Enzyme design. Structure first.
Site, PDB file in Angstrom:
ATOM      1  N   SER A  20     -96.109   9.101 -51.220  1.00 61.03           N
ATOM      2  CA  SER A  20     -95.587  10.187 -52.087  1.00 61.03           C
ATOM      3  C   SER A  20     -95.637   9.856 -53.595  1.00 61.03           C
ATOM      4  CB  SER A  20     -94.105  10.460 -51.822  1.00 61.03           C
ATOM      5  OG  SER A  20     -93.978  11.324 -50.686  1.00 61.03           O
ATOM      6  N   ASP A  67     -85.873  14.609 -69.385  1.00 51.64           N
ATOM      7  CA  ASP A  67     -87.255  14.069 -69.477  1.00 51.64           C
ATOM      8  C   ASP A  67     -88.282  14.884 -68.692  1.00 51.64           C
ATOM      9  OD1 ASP A  67     -88.603  12.098 -70.920  1.00 51.64           O
ATOM     10  OD2 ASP A  67     -88.723  10.679 -69.310  1.00 51.64           O
ATOM     11  N   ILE A 122     -87.088   8.760 -74.635  1.00 49.01           N
ATOM     12  CA  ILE A 122     -86.210   8.499 -73.495  1.00 49.01           C
ATOM     13  C   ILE A 122     -86.947   8.294 -72.185  1.00 49.01           C
ATOM     14  CG2 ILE A 122     -84.359   9.891 -74.593  1.00 49.01           C
ATOM     15  CD1 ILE A 122     -84.855  11.966 -72.252  1.00 49.01           C
ATOM     16  N   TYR A 182    -107.495  16.559 -44.146  1.00 42.94           N
ATOM     17  CA  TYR A 182    -108.559  17.561 -44.329  1.00 42.94           C
ATOM     18  C   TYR A 182    -109.544  17.136 -45.400  1.00 42.94           C
ATOM     19  CZ  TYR A 182    -105.515  20.587 -41.552  1.00 42.94           C
ATOM     20  OH  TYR A 182    -104.701  21.106 -40.564  1.00 42.94           O
ATOM     21  N   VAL A 218    -109.066  17.999 -49.198  1.00 43.22           N
ATOM     22  CA  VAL A 218    -107.878  17.452 -49.897  1.00 43.22           C
ATOM     23  C   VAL A 218    -108.139  15.992 -50.204  1.00 43.22           C
ATOM     24  CG1 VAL A 218    -105.342  16.900 -49.619  1.00 43.22           C
ATOM     25  CG2 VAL A 218    -106.314  19.007 -48.626  1.00 43.22           C
ATOM     26  N   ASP A 238     -93.125  20.710 -53.067  1.00 42.93           N
ATOM     27  CA  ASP A 238     -92.197  19.629 -52.750  1.00 42.93           C
ATOM     28  C   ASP A 238     -90.780  20.180 -52.560  1.00 42.93           C
ATOM     29  OD1 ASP A 238     -90.884  16.922 -52.923  1.00 42.93           O
ATOM     30  OD2 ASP A 238     -92.935  16.296 -53.444  1.00 42.93           O
ATOM     31  N   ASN A 257     -97.495   7.373 -44.521  1.00 40.21           N
ATOM     32  CA  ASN A 257     -96.903   6.037 -44.551  1.00 40.21           C
ATOM     33  C   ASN A 257     -96.862   5.465 -43.122  1.00 40.21           C
ATOM     34  OD1 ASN A 257     -96.291   6.533 -47.264  1.00 40.21           O
ATOM     35  ND2 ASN A 257     -94.139   7.059 -46.832  1.00 40.21           N
ATOM     36  N   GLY A 293    -103.469  15.678 -46.031  1.00 43.29           N
ATOM     37  CA  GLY A 293    -104.354  14.680 -46.605  1.00 43.29           C
ATOM     38  C   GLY A 293    -105.617  14.491 -45.771  1.00 43.29           C
ATOM     39  N   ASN A 308     -91.531  11.097 -75.270  1.00 41.15           N
ATOM     40  CA  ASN A 308     -90.413  11.207 -76.199  1.00 41.15           C
ATOM     41  C   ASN A 308     -89.804   9.807 -76.294  1.00 41.15           C
ATOM     42  OD1 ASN A 308     -89.088  10.975 -73.810  1.00 41.15           O
ATOM     43  ND2 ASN A 308     -88.504  13.160 -73.641  1.00 41.15           N
ATOM     44  N   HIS A 312     -86.611  13.949 -54.127  1.00 41.65           N
ATOM     45  CA  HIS A 312     -88.007  13.571 -53.981  1.00 41.65           C
ATOM     46  C   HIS A 312     -88.922  14.368 -54.934  1.00 41.65           C
ATOM     47  CE1 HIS A 312     -91.961  13.717 -51.888  1.00 41.65           C
ATOM     48  NE2 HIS A 312     -91.698  12.473 -51.545  1.00 41.65           N
TER      49      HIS A 312
END
Ligand SMILES: [Ca+2]
Ligand code: NA
Lengths: 281, 64
Positions: free
Chosen positions: A221, A41, A79, A171, A174, A32, A155, A169, A77, A64
């Site tokens: 995503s 976090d 938070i 293939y 995947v 990414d 999308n 995606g 945790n 992203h």
């Protein structure tokens, strides 16, 4: 106080957490735009950048990759949010620059890094309308090597009877993930086609953003890392299961929604996936 | 509401920007080379323009 985003609950991740399984020791590459490792976090275990002009994978100048990473593995945790697999070993594999784009060779180099570094799961919240032989070979190689490879379906919404699932995606090796909302309705932008495999929450998904922020994003995503995180939960409960088995467990235990052209097999259910015996609910 | 511009394929990137901003003045336009891989988040304010090496539009622009 920590908040559990609705999508983590919707895929039944808390059932695994209550059994004691949180993705510990499972290595997940977020391929990414980088991951902001300074976020309190997130815990980033390692990584590498394939972007020639942005050599630090731990600096995310887009936002992203950080959001995607928080859905996989935001820490457990007091938070922020809670990730699907909050103990996963998270790797920032930066293949997209600040502008959200990368060359095919950068993505391929990231996939190769993931293979060479023994990643158990790859998430690719990315895509393009065309494939390449080299891209197909890289994903096929990762899967042959034992890696669970998960990607956003795209999308592109609908286009009559045509598939609109993008690559990688599209293939067969995947797992292509579409987006639903909190009512299990397909998001209007979610790509469609016989290559759509499963769905996960992808509307108004709260997660980590760079500079110690949080925010709600939309997209396939956002759906993909619910499935990559679910794969890590499964592997933490069944560390010898192969990628073949993790993939089948997720496919074979979805909650079926509509027609498979629009919904694939339905919404993932990681509680059911992580049982030995699998059926749809 | 216009959300796709198939009539812009094969036009210059300049004309595409002008036309999209008439239809959607608040659009956040980003220009990228065709044949790259991009993030799969959906941003209702964004219109990506994918250009060939001549700076002409090579793919149907759409919101997202
Ligand atoms: Ca947290
Ligand atoms: Na696929």
């Amino acid at each position: 106080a920590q908040s559990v985003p609705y999508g983590v609950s919707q895929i039944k991740a808390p059932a695994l957490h209550s059994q004691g399984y949180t993705g510990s020791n499972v290595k997940v590459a977020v391929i990414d735009s980088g991951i902001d490792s300074s976020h309190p976090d997130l815990k980033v275990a390692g990584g590498a950048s394939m972007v020639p002009s942005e050599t630090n994978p731990f600096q995310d100048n887009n936002s992203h990759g950080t959001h995607v990473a928080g859905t996989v593995a935001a820490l457990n945790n007091s938070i922020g949010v809670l990730g699907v697999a909050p103990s996963a070993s998270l790797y920032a594999v930066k293949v997209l620059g600040a502008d959200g784009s990368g060359q095919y060779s950068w993505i391929i180099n990231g996939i190769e890094w993931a293979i060479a570094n023994n990643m158990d799961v790859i998430n690719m919240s990315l895509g393009g309308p065309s494939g390449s032989a080299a891209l197909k070979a890289a994903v096929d190689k990762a899967v042959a090597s034992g890696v669970v490879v998960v990607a956003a379906a795209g999308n592109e919404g609908t286009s009559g009877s045509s598939s609109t699932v993008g690559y990688p995606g599209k293939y067969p090796s995947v797992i292509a993930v579409g987006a639903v909302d909190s009512s299990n309705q397909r998001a209007s932008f979610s790509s469609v086609g016989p290559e759509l495999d499963v769905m996960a929450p992808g509307v108004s998904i709260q997660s980590t953003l760079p500079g110690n922020k949080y925010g709600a994003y939309n997209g396939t995503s956002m759906a993909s890392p619910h499935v990559a995180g679910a794969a890590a939960l499964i592997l933490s409960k069944h560390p010898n299961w192969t990628n073949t088995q993790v993939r089948s467990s997720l496919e074979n235990t979805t909650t079926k929604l509509g027609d498979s052209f629009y919904y694939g097999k339905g919404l993932i259910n990681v509680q059911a996936a992580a049982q030995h015996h699998h059926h749809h609910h | 509401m216009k959300t796709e511009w198939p009539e812009l394929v094969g036009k210059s990137v300049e004309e595409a920007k002008k036309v999209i901003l008439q239809d959607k003045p608040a659009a956040q336009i980003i220009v990228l080379p065709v044949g790259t891989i991009v993030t799969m988040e959906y941003r209702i304010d964004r219109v990506r323009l994918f250009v060939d090496r001549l700076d002409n539009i090579a793919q149907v622009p759409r919101v997202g």
